[PDB]
């Protein structure tokens, strides 16, 4: 059957340095085993280049919250998102210097998104930075996402739920995630086995404490298949 797994905060912990989130041997073994028994999909806001190096396994992925997928190794742009490739290049070029204007600010460039991390930044200039980002968004016609210590410019209309729905249709599936974008995905796929990771109110059918418990559940599902055959 199908299994859709969010990456950050679901399979790995949320950390201050997101560029370091490579999968450890434990996760590599778990997913390696899991993909042998289930059609496995990593669903993330990360790019295919990121997940590909973080988790170098033979699995499918829905990236950028659905703007691009990597299926059977093929980079597949969805909803004509490739029309935005030149846009994000320009956005990065015109805003990369902000790292000096706002010491502490970190900018993560991706083909279809530019993520501004305010984690190490001073509090005082955040409202100013936020307004600058929104201005760039209006200028280039892109969409702005506000997360925890994060502000990301992305392709308008991306939606994890819709992307997942599009793949599974009505087929049975497991869907796991840790934040609002996943909560929304559960809503768009409420007939699936929804799993919430972390604290907070949720409508998921099952709930786990953290990525460690999440991994344990996946570990168990694997053992179930070993007996099942
Ligand atoms: Mg997450
Ligand atoms: Na992470
Ligand atoms: Na976690």
């Amino acid at each position: 059957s199908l299994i859709f797994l969010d990456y950050d905060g679901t399979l790995v912990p949320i950390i201050m340095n997101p560029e370091e989130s490579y999968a450890d041997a434990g996760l590599l073994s778990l997913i390696s085993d899991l993909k042998e028994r289930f059609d496995t999909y990593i669903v993330t806001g990360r790019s295919p280049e990121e997940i590909s190096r973080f988790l170098p396994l033979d699995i499918n992925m829905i990236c950028y919250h659905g703007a691009c997928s990597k299926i059977n190794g093929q980079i597949v742009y969805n909803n004509g998102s490739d029309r935005f490739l030149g846009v994000f290049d320009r956005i990065y070029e015109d805003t990369r210097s902000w790292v000096s204007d706002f010491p502490g600010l970190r900018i993560y460039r991706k083909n279809l998104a530019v993520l501004y991390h305010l984690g190490l930044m001073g509090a005082d200039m955040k409202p100013k930075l936020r307004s600058r980002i929104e201005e760039i968004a209006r200028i280039f016609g892109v969409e702005t996402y506000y997360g925890k210590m994060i502000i990301e410019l992305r392709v308008p209309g991306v939606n994890k739920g819709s992307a997942i729905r599009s793949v599974r249709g009505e087929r049975p599936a497991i869907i796991a995630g840790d934040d609002a974008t996943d909560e929304a995905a559960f809503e768009a796929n409420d007939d699936a086995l929804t799993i919430k990771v972390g604290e907070g109110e949720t409508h998921a059918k099952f709930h786990v404490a953290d990525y460690i418990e999440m991994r344990k559940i996946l570990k168990f599902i694997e053992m179930l298949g070993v007996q099942k055959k």
Side-chain angles (χ1 to χ4, degrees), residues 70-87:
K70 183 174 178 177
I71 308 294
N72 295 318
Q74 183 176 37
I75 299 302
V76 178
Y77 294 102
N78 303 141
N79 316 144
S81 64
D82 52 316
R83 293 172 297 174
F84 288 92
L85 292 177
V87 179

Side-chain angles (χ1 to χ4, degrees), residues 52-72:
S52 290
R53 61 179 183 264
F54 285 159
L55 192 72
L57 301 174
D58 176 46
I59 37 72
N60 291 321
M61 55 188 80
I62 293 173
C63 301
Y64 298 118
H65 289 281
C68 189
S69 304
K70 183 174 178 177
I71 308 294
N72 295 318

Side-chain angles (χ1 to χ4, degrees), residues 19-68:
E19 68 277 9
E20 303 179 9
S21 300
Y22 284 71
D24 56 28
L27 180 54
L28 290 170
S29 171
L30 277 172
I31 299 301
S32 175
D33 289 348
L34 189 68
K35 70 97 167 59
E36 289 292 301
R37 299 183 187 292
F38 305 80
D39 192 337
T40 309
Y41 284 84
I42 293 300
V43 183
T44 175
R46 299 273 194 167
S47 62
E49 293 67 50
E50 282 174 295
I51 301 297
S52 290
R53 61 179 183 264
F54 285 159
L55 192 72
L57 301 174
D58 176 46
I59 37 72
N60 291 321
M61 55 188 80
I62 293 173
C63 301
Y64 298 118
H65 289 281
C68 189

Side-chain angles (χ1 to χ4, degrees), residues 103-117:
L105 170 67
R106 286 174 294 179
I107 298 173
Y108 298 88
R109 177 185 188 173
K110 302 172 189 193
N111 295 325
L112 293 174
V114 179
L115 184 158
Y116 301 86
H117 201 307

